[PDB]
Write a protein that binds this DNA or RNA. Sequence first.
DNA 1: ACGTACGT
DNA 2: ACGTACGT
Lengths: 8, 8
Amino acid sequence: XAXVXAXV
Amino acid sequence: XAXVXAXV
DNA sequence: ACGTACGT
DNA sequence: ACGTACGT
Ligand SMILES: *C(=O)c1cnc2ccccc2n1
Ligand SMILES: *C(=O)c1cnc2ccccc2n1
Ligand SMILES: *C(=O)c1cnc2ccccc2n1
Ligand SMILES: *C(=O)c1cnc2ccccc2n1
Ligand SMILES: [Mn+2]
Ligand SMILES: [Mn+2]
């Protein structure tokens, strides 16, 4: 759920 | 992510 | 269930 | 002169 590199 | 010239 | 982020 | 960055 976090988006820092994918943002699921 | 390394920073040795840009640091991203 | 998911990888993005640069230049001296 | 090289890899760090999170939870809905
Ligand atoms: C977001 O909160 C989140 C948490 N755990 C994960 C595990 C695997 C893929 C994506 C995920 N996203
Ligand atoms: C994004 O591509 C990405 C990859 N790995 C991680 C590990 C820990 C926190 C955040 C991350 N983000
Ligand atoms: C940092 O770990 C890192 C890794 N690969 C990259 C590629 C392109 C721009 C920035 C990057 N940063
Ligand atoms: C910084 O500007 C920079 C440019 N190219 C590189 C190549 C290899 C290692 C580190 C680098 N840093
Ligand atoms: Mn991963
Ligand atoms: Mn987790």
